[PDB]
Amino acid sequence: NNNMSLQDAEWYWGDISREEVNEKLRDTADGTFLVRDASTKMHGDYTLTLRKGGNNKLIKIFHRDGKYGFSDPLTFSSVVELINHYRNESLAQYNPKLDVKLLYPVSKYQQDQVVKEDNIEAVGKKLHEYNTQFQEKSREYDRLYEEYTRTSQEIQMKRTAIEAFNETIKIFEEQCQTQERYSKEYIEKFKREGNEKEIQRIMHNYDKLKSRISEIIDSRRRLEEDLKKQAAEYREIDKRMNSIKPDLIQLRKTRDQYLMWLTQKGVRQKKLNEWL
Amino acid sequence: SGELWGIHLMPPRILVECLLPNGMIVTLECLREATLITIKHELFKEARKYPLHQLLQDESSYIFVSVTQEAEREEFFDETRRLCDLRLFQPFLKVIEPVGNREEKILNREIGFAIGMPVCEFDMVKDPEVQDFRRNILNVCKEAVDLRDLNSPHSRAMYVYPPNVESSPELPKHIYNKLDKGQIIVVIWVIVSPNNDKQKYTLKINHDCVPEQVIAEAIRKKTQGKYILKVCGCDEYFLEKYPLSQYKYIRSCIMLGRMPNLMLMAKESLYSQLPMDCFTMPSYSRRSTKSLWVINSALRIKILCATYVNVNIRDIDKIYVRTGIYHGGEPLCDNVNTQRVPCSNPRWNEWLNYDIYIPDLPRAARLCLSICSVKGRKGAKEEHCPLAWGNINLFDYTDTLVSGKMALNLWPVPHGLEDLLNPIGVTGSNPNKETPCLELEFDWFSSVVKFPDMSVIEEHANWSVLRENDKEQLKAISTRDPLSEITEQEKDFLWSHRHYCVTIPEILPKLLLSVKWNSRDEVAQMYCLVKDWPPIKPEQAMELLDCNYPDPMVRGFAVRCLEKYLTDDKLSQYLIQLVQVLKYEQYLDNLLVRFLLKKALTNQRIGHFFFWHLKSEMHNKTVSQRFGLLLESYCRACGMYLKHLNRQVEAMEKLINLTDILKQEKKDETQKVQMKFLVEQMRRPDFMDALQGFLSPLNPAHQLGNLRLEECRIMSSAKRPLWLNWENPDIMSELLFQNNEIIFKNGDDLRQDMLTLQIIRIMENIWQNQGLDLRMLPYGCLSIGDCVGLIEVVRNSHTIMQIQCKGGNSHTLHQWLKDKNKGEIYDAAIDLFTRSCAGYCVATFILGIGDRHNSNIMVKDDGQLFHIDFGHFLDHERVPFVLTQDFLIVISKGAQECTKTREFERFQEMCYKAYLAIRQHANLFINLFSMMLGSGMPELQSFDDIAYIRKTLALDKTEQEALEYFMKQMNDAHHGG
Numbered sequence A: 001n002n003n004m005s006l007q008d009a010e011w012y013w014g015d016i017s018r019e020e021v022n023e024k025l026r027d028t029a030d031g032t033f034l035v036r037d038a039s040t041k042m043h044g045d046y047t048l049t050l051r052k053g054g055n056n057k058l059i060k061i062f063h064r065d066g067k068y069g070f071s072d073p074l075t076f077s078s079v080v081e082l083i084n085h086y087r088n089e090s091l092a093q094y095n096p097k098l099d100v101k102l103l104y105p106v107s108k109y110q111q112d113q114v115v116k117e118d119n120i121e122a123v124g125k126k127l128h129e130y131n132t133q134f135q136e137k138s139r140e141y142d143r144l145y146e147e148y149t150r151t152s153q154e155i156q157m158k159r160t161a162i163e164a165f166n167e168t169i170k171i172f173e174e175q176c177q178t179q180e181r182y183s184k185e186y187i188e189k190f191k192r193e194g195n196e197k198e199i200q201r202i203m204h205n206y207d208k209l210k211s212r213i214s215e216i217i218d219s220r221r222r223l224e225e226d227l228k229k230q231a232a233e234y235r236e237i238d239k240r241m242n243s244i245k246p247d248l249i250q251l252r253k254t255r256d257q258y259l260m261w262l263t264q265k266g267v268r269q270k271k272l273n274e275w276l
Numbered sequence B: 001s002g003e004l005w006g007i008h009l010m011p012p013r014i015l016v017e018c019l020l021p022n023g024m025i026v027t028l029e030c031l032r033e034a035t036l037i038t039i040k041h042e043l044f045k046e047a048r049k050y051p052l053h054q055l056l057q058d059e060s061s062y063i064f065v066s067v068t069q070e071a072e073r074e075e076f077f078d079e080t081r082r083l084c085d086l087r088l089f090q091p092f093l094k095v096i097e098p099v100g101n102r103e104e105k106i107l108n109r110e111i112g113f114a115i116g117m118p119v120c121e122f123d124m125v126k127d128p129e130v131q132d133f134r135r136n137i138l139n140v141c142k143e144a145v146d147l148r149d150l151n152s153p154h155s156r157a158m159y160v161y162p163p164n165v166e167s168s169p170e171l172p173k174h175i176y177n178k179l180d181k182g183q184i185i186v187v188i189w190v191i192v193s194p195n196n197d198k199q200k201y202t203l204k205i206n207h208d209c210v211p212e213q214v215i216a217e218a219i220r221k222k223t224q225g226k227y228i229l230k231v232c233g234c235d236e237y238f239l240e241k242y243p244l245s246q247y248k249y250i251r252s253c254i255m256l257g258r259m260p261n262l263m264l265m266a267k268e269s270l271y272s273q274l275p276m277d278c279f280t281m282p283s284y285s286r287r288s289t290k291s292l293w294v295i296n297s298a299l300r301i302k303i304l305c306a307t308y309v310n311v312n313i314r315d316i317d318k319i320y321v322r323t324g325i326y327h328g329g330e331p332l333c334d335n336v337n338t339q340r341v342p343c344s345n346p347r348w349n350e351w352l353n354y355d356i357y358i359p360d361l362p363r364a365a366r367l368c369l370s371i372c373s374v375k376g377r378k379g380a381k382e383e384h385c386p387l388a389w390g391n392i393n394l395f396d397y398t399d400t401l402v403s404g405k406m407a408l409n410l411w412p413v414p415h416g417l418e419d420l421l422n423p424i425g426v427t428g429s430n431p432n433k434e435t436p437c438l439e440l441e442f443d444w445f446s447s448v449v450k451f452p453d454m455s456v457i458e459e460h461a462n463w464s465v466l467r468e469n470d471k472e473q474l475k476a477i478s479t480r481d482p483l484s485e486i487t488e489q490e491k492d493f494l495w496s497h498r499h500y501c502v503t504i505p506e507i508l509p510k511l512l513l514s515v516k517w518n519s520r521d522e523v524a525q526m527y528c529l530v531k532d533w534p535p536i537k538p539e540q541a542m543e544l545l546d547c548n549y550p551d552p553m554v555r556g557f558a559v560r561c562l563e564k565y566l567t568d569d570k571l572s573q574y575l576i577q578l579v580q581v582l583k584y585e586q587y588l589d590n591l592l593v594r595f596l597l598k599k600a601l602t603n604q605r606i607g608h609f610f611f612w613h614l615k616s617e618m619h620n621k622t623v624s625q626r627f628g629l630l631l632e633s634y635c636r637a638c639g640m641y642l643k644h645l646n647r648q649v650e651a652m653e654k655l656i657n658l659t660d661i662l663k664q665e666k667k668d669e670t671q672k673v674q675m676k677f678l679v680e681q682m683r684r685p686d687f688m689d690a691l692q693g694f695l696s697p698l699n700p701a702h703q704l705g706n707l708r709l710e711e712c713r714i715m716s717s718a719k720r721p722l723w724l725n726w727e728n729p730d731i732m733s734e735l736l737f738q739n740n741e742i743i744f745k746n747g748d749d750l751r752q753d754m755l756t757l758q759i760i761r762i763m764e765n766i767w768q769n770q771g772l773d774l775r776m777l778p779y780g781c782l783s784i785g786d787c788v789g790l791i792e793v794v795r796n797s798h799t800i801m802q803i804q805c806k807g808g809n810s811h812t813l814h815q816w817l818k819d820k821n822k823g824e825i826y827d828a829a830i831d832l833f834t835r836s837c838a839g840y841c842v843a844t845f846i847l848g849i850g851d852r853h854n855s856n857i858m859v860k861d862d863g864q865l866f867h868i869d870f871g872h873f874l875d876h877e878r879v880p881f882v883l884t885q886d887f888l889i890v891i892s893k894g895a896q897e898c899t900k901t902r903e904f905e906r907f908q909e910m911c912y913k914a915y916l917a918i919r920q921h922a923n924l925f926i927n928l929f930s931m932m933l934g935s936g937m938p939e940l941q942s943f944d945d946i947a948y949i950r951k952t953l954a955l956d957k958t959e960q961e962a963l964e965y966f967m968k969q970m971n972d973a974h975h976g977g
């Protein structure tokens, strides 16, 4: 009741690497904790990972003379008794600055009730079919990302082209003001004398500037419309990836959960490796 | 690319329309290669058939201004430039009267070409920090320039030809045994001006003799302050007063049993080539508050409307904003969240409250926030997926707490990231204003809050305030690797004995993690210990520069250790990681940037690689501006090397453009059509002149000569890599080599391969000094852009696949080795294949590089073995010993009973001695990977990836225990042996 073997404890997880511990405590509430074997692998260490203040603490359960504890006085019969003492009380007694009541242990049994088809045959088919779903979904996501990155580059060079078009149009526009102002003092002299050749050439080529400048504006106009069309598709490509990412993550975790479940139950992965 | 927008083809004759000052328009048909000087001459004698001419009054006083492809209106002051290379946006050229300095504008055109962006871009930024950095970084540029010109033209030479020496004057014992009485036979080559006739010299001199007596003693055999010593071949000179064996070239000859041949060159001749350093300050160089500790209120941030988020209204139920104050990577409090709102009206008119008081905010605090979308479906499941992220510094570079409204642009989520927040990221707004935008508003205190200066912190510290037998625990903690787990009992133990840790300077990184950073009382005390801390080795002080130690004072102390201990020999080795650390700096004006820039402006070998490492990372939009400002400052004061860097950049651009057509346009064709097409587009003068007569980016000492179009094909591997072949311009080419072969890859990431080739070099240096003769061949690799790089080619190397195909079993590799070298050299060739084979077994297993086959394993005719094509590492214990049966025959000298042979037993011994040697240096390798987390490699996202090294090296186990872990792995792969 109060004190059974540490093996049959919902919070004890055995031997899990610190990489696995962090992912289980990630984005969890304050007070969540789980016991596990120490990194050194020496018998009787039982590091107690704790989550307080957004940080994942780490407290080692020292062992000496068949007794366990945190400080040098090991006044506890076993790990279960020691943890249970702090499950109903805060750790301020152990450390003045450490305030937590070890509320929410990460029970290993809860994840158990997520897998069905306890028989080997059914799990083999589900995991194999899930890998096809996970692999197909991942491939589809991979295709979108390359399109998303590719489309990002295309729009960037479209923005620069429009930026350059502003400079070119500005030069022609500015020169028109300068050209018109320049043709102000000699225009009267041309009108005074009957020289039609100068008028035709001045007007003929002056319109050429208008024609050339008009073409520049039209060319820029098409680019802006193309940029708008390209930009809209850029968001649509982004929309698909945003809605595919959450589904891919869930499939990957569920697929991994089945894979570990099969291996843990005394099954060599060589048979599963060919199953894929 | 190309010579015009969109159209990369340049017709020989094009109707180029100019704009004369009088507002006139006239069309011209110039040449593609015609210089702008000629264009002006022809253009001016073409207006006589036009309305007005009196305004011209001369042919000069006009600059031919126009627009470029970078959206920049270039001035074209250098009229000698050809119209082809002007990068015109559209055919047109406006004639304008000269304006500006006319000399500083020319430089800005060369600086822009090298950096890749117009220099005017930095001048259009209104950010006060961007402009302040530009005007302040010129102090380091000026100091370095003055430093170079201190003694004489000699000081100028040492800048352009930095001696490549080693920080190890004493030779390893085993190599010293290679010298008969500590003397090395060297042949000195002296060239006589009449007919340029060669000459010989046999010299037997002591290893520990500087070039001064080498040169003088050689004169006695001829039968002063001149006649410098140069390496026959590449540009490498023996100038500084060092022991002869101290240099890298002479040491390499000793290790490989070769007689170094050197050239005698007159000193005056070398100084003639040295140009003058003309560094002129640019135009931009000439152009109350209450302490933070008195503000009593919790840090409160108000969120507001998000401009827009790309989320489907039906796929995702609701969205919310997650925030949290971080210091480095560790939060300073619990992450706060905003009320979930439908993803159609992201209003969030909410005040966020944090559990941290304002006075307790560390100077390096950041506000990491992100937009997360909660699914809230699947019955009893709640999945959060980030939509964007953005970091905000709480103190601008002036030590002022951010106050008032502020608009922040979010970043796209990195690939393969699932954490809601991204604390390890660049703290700034997205330059692309067309992304999600989050509006924040920090509360106003009726005044500007300034972080207390140094004096105030000192008063608070030491104001609130013998030996111990159990000091062995402090010693034990120091040796633990950086990634090791530290318990709360040790954290509370290091801090209590912080004053006794000064006697163990190696414990500083561990004592920096035991201090609560959200408590000004504890942080104040720490600043005192760091102030008067003993200096540590650069290897240990290099780990205080990564993302785990963001305090400005902690990083400043680390840099001061680099300055006084980091030799230019080691600086060039770790320079790959030091550049990456520049992305972890909070602000643009750091102490590391001033240290890095001072070294680049003093050494031309460091500057060469400093330029290329920064340049290759300019495609990233996160560090595009930070590195762009860093390159512009260097390019302005780099001196006359910018002319050489223009040849390389221009040359590399031709290959990139050419290589993009063989994989984009002519990709669905045969192998002979591509080769003829590739050969066709190399005889053109534009391509021919650009790809000749410039230094090789991989090794600046190698000046690439005339191209050899006959022997340049397309590698039938990867994605059409291009096998380019060059010549050796110097007359002394046959001594070293007569061909510089370089593989130009365009489409493969060369950063994983560039980092592996550097870990191999460090591994081989550890074993060389220890005593082991494990010889590896870490060829030269370099990344010059986005998934484009160059690879050096090793001479006379065939893959194991080639021999099997050409040798046609299991004795083909051994049979070929026997045929190539028969006689007394067979034993050496069999022992070189053994030492080389053993070295790559330990290195390959530790790093877990991609699986090897007979296609990416090369064996030289001398018997040496080396690996190529380093695909991936650490991802793709669970990796076996790559040794295969094809090598046991060679190891056992052809014996069939290889399993329990005497030769094989010696092979196992050298594998254990190599494995244990690296295990004792695991700290160095853990720190190298810890400085590349932000690099962006797909397999180096976080410290989780680096956990592979801690497992293959068996760091937690015992030294004796770790040995049998390697034993089990080696036997398991071979199923015994």
Ligand SMILES: CCNC(=O)[C@H](Cc1ccc(C#Cc2ccc3nccnc3c2)cc1)NC(=O)c1ccc2nc(C)c(C)nc2c1
Residues within 6 Å of the ligand: B711, B712, B713, B714, B715, B716, B717, B723, B725, B743, B779, B791, B792, B793, B794, B797, B868, B869
């Ligand atoms: C079934 C079809 N088979 C082939 O067609 C073979 C296979 C084959 C040969 C050789 C390497 C190789 C290599 C290599 C790769 C990376 C390296 N990294 C560092 C150092 N050395 C390295 C050497 C691979 C593969 N021929 C080529 O593909 C080929 C193409 C162009 C060439 N052009 C020149 C100028 C020369 C000298 N040979 C060429 C060889």
